[model samples]
Target chain A: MVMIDLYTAATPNGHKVSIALEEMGLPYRVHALSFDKKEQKAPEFLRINPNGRIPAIVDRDNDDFAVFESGAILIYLAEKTGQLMPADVKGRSRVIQWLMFQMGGVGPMQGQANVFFRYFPEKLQGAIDRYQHETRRLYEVLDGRLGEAEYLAGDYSIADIATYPWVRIHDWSGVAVDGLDNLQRWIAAIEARPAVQRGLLVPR
Target chain B: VMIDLYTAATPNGHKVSIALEEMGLPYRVHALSFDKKEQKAPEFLRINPNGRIPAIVDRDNDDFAVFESGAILIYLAEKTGQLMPADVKGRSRVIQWLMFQMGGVGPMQGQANVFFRYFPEKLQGAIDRYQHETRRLYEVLDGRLGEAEYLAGDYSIADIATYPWVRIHDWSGVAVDGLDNLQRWIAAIEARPAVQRGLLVPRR
Candidate 1:
């Protein structure tokens, strides 16, 4: 039997792997790290991910091979199961394109919004406005794409898995999605998934 | 035999240009003008709905357009099978570091640029936050390089993706002189003939 050890926290990135594991029906052990305690930076955890971040995995089935970065973790899980992604060249590239969209665009912009609006010690309205505006622009792009397609890619692939968690928490970053009907529809559809529901509360 | 790259002189744009040069792929570059807001134009938006530069059109394959620098790097690497490792573990390692650049370094450094250079108002707190984060990320890369020859063992696409952004540390006001290992890696990549040629693309 294949066993995976997932070291993660309750962030959008962490949920990406958990959701993928549940969707793939993989047997896995969850080791949640405490941000307040700085457990992610511990030397032992650093070995698994030299970047010292959460949402890393060690696949016991694959010689304890470790993978870090949420985008890479999602790709690893999809390739391992060969389920959530496509086998053909064109289809696979399409999924990867959208996954990269989230990795480079949505995730970073939303993260900045959180930092400026919630985490920064000083209230810099200019900085907060810059990030929040950028985050909204990204949502508009996602909404437009969703208007024509059911998912980020042609079907529910790793791209959708990587992006959904971040969009779901838009309010936390002070970005609103009230007018993004297509995005709201997509979010609702994924929220109703049994696997996603199970994955969100992982390591609780 | 046909690849059309729509790009600018920015770090993200340099990534694809460098990868294409490294893979020995002959291509044409159509420079987009930020001065005219050409990237957000409807014609360019059709190629990248995100309306970003550094996108590619594989005219050899039904004119398929791919965006997001990270995805473009993977597509080029897989197409040529030149830069990435052959084994699963090695490939995953390459991808992890590539995502590290996408999710961490690029965003942080880009933010540093906005706060430190572009913004009309001086927000020292915001500027310091991003610059500090960028420096911390460089330290992480320096630590990893101290152990390996490249970001993901042996020079690969991950290094190509990161080198462009980190090379422009001065523009972002994120000092890198103290990080000796990162400096060595940066200098080595900058000396590559293909990389030198790539940086000259989409003309300043």
Candidate 2:
């Protein structure tokens, strides 16, 4: 049996690893860190992830090895299980490409929307508009791709896992999904997964 | 022996170019014109459904097109088995830092550039938010570089992915003057022949 210790919160990034663990049927323990208390930056947590960010894991099964960054954690879990990700070079590259899209595009743009619209010190409409527009554009891209394929890649893979959480919180970022039928479909499909349901409520 | 790179002379574009040079891969470069919105053209969209620059088509493998600079760097590194570590832990470490750049530094700095330079409305708060975050990210990088000569223990794709963005800190208005360790790492990477050659790619 492999032992994995997940240090995370309820953010979109944190849900990525939790969902993957459940989908992979990997047994793991979750240590929920409180952002209000800055628990994620605690010395003990920092030992596991020098970056002091959530969604980091220590693979106790592998000499207590630690991995941080949600994207990296998803890839590590996928490689470890060899389940969600493909084996072929092209298939793997496709999955990675989509994963990077979420990492570099959707996640950041949506995060900025959240900051400007929900968390900023003042009402910066221009900033909010800029980020919201970019977020919507990225959502359109996802919708277009989802219209062509059932999943971001060939099948339900890490790309979907990495992206689903971020897209789920689009409303919080003040980004609407109106007229994005394909994106809505993808969201509902993933939301219906039992593992995802269980994973989202982790660390309770 | 056959790789087709579609790129512009931007930080993200330079990432793939630098990696290709480091890997010693002989490839053709198709410099897309930003003025013509060439990256969003139908032909380029076929190559990168995301319609982004820094995409590549691997001609030796059924002309498979890979988008996303992070994904391209991983593909090139995995293809040649160079720069990236082969061992599991080392590889995971490299990936963590790469994700850090993709999810943190690149987007933050890119947004800083938009507000500070490109955006029409001069929103000081918006500009400050991104610039501050970018500086924090740089400080994190500086701390990591202080502990090790490069990111992830040795010079690898993690460094390759990050250096391009950090190199252009001036353009983003996020200064890196006091970070001696990071400056040393940057200078070292910039001095590399391959890196120098990659920066000149796709022409001005």
Candidate 3:
């Protein structure tokens, strides 16, 4: 039985891969890591992801070929199944551009927001404010894009898949989506997906 | 003769220029002045709705605009089939490492720059947090370099995407000391003529 061995955690990055797997209908076995135990940086897991992060996969179907980095895993699976990503040049670039935006822009800034807002010991209001404002700006950019297209790209793509997990948790990062009608609608629509719902609870 | 490179003199921006030079892609550089906030202009916003630098418009392909340094690298690699492997497994391998840079190294180091240099409050905890994380990421890259010459496979976009950021470790206030493997890799990449050329783009 060739299936994906998903090494994941309950994170925005982790959820990006799981949701992608669910949407593509790929059969997978979940191996969730415990961050408290530092399981991600263990020797065995390091072979899978030298960077030691969540949401990596080994396609047991393909000689146990392993890939890490949630963004890359999404692209790997998308290209593997040819389901969520488009084949045409232009359309494919569109999906990748937004995916890059999430990877480089939204993911990092929102993650920082969570850090300063939730985890940090001392209250660093400046750091908190910077991240929250930047995250909101990124949301506005996405909202503008969503206003133009139903999804982030030509259709429901890995771009949107990568984005939804982070955006859905905006409040947790102290960012709000007020006045962003398109973004609110986009979030609501993705939240309604059965696959997305199932994907969110993988570690359970 | 076709691709219009919208860029500035930054790590993320330099990533694309390096890739274009390495891939031998013909493009015209349209430098965006960060001080003037030219990246936020309406004309550029139409190209990259996010209003950021390191965008490209491919005149050879219906005037399509691509943004995000990582995405631009992928687009050019696919268009020319030069920097990335054509096979799915190989391509995915390269992309995985690229994602490591996009999601890991670039963002962490960028934050290190922010808290270390730009932040007004001089928050020691925040600075330590980002710097420590960046150093850890560099160690991960050093460990990976111990196994292979390039990040993924032979001189692919993954390496191109990462080199610009890692080379500036000092400016970000992260130590590259004691990382022998990473230093060797950096020296080798720095010797490349194209990389030298790429670093001087958007000539003032």
Candidate 4:
């Protein structure tokens, strides 16, 4: 039996998992599914995750427990190891709140910005503007949060891990992170982490 | 002092109230007018830098603020020890579905709403893209519901997290046609008194 089989790709969502695995010191085997091969949607992969998305995990250490969704995988890994997330009720919820913000707001909004700006065939400036502005708005929010506190949850937690990948790639999504001094400083700190650097190129 | 819930009447706003009511939490609602851009107001921003609804301040915890609907749901559940299970894996499962709703369902359907109703330009490509993705997420939920009565184990925060969004599918222009399990799941959740009460919260 293996420890954890991490299904991931080169996207921000996929990067979140590897960063967590590295930071948490959790042993995991990366099963990088090729989007070009359409392997993520294969029937075998579908059973592992009906949504057929990357960044899912199968925990062999825990009876082969399978978890899909990037946010879920992050929480599972964090709690399973008693690392990354806080143990206190309020502190734990604080971590989760910021994690959800990344999952629901930053990740999806930036994803839409990428789709509209980089991938979409049609140059729908309206849609692009809508998402890009929204992503910028979210960046402003993150900037504000970092201004008030050091980390999203008042400590270096999974919330930061979940959000950094997307924010680090902001230029690609057509959302500039300029004027966000606090967020930029926060980004630089995370970028300097050897674990984050390692996670970035893992399985590439 | 009780929990101070700053919210509007939107689905995301309603998600918190639904959990608060369902968990029998003592709370009071201060409805923010979306048309007035109240959520983005500086006063509300102090509570949620993301400047979105619904957010909660537990007066009991030195006025601790929690933002993001998924995070709030988990917060309330953990606070009451009512919805999520005590077991680790069970809690992870509950979180898995909650994350699914946050990352997959909410964002996609929300875009469907934006493209379908709010956006000034009639961008069919963007509209169809969000609607199709929203419908696909619903289908994923339907398949999951077929295997279990609720997302995760028992009627946990996972169900509370998802119900508000799924119930408003028509508003997003996503259909539940022939998704019998999804329809059934929707009906069952809707029939709950807590859900009904929660839906009407922060009423205009």
Which candidate leads in DockQ?
Answer: 3
TM-score of each: 0.98, 0.98, 0.98, 0.97
Error of 3 at B135 (Å): 0.8
- The per-prediction CA RMSD against the true structure, in angstroms, equals 1.1, 1.1, 1.0, 1.3
In model 3, which runs have C-alpha deviations exceeding 4 angstroms?
Answer: none
Candidate 1's displacement at residue B192, Å, is 0.6
Give the lDDT of residue A28 in candidate 1.
97
Local distance difference test scores for all models: 0.92, 0.92, 0.91, 0.89
For candidate 3, the per-residue lDDT at A140 reads 97
DockQ of each: 0.86, 0.87, 0.90, 0.86
Residue B47 lDDT in candidate 4: 89
Residue-by-residue lDDT tens digits, candidate 2, B167-192: 99999999998999999999899999
Q: What tens-digit string does per-residue lDDT give for candidate 2 at A5-45?
A: 99988889999989999999988998989889988778888
Interface RMSD (Å) of model 3?
0.7
Question: At residue B105, what lDDT does model 1 achieve?
Answer: 95
Per-residue lDDT of A72-151 in model 1, one digit per residue for the tens?
99988888889989988788898999999999899999988998899988888887898899999999999999998999
Model 1 misplaced regions, further than 4 Å: none
lDDT of 4 by residue, B1-204 (tens): 379999888888888898888888889889988788998788898888877788999998888888888888887887788899988789888888889889988889989998899989888998899999999999998898888888775888888878888888888888999999889888889999998999999877
Which 10-residue window of candidate 3 chain A scores lowest in summed lDDT? A47-56
Task: Give the distance in Å from residue B103's predicted Cα in candidate 3 to where it truly belongs.
Answer: 0.7
Tens-digit per-residue lDDT, A20-87, candidate 4: 99998878898989988999999999888989998889999888889998889988888888998989
TM-score of B chain for each model?
Answer: 0.97, 0.98, 0.98, 0.96
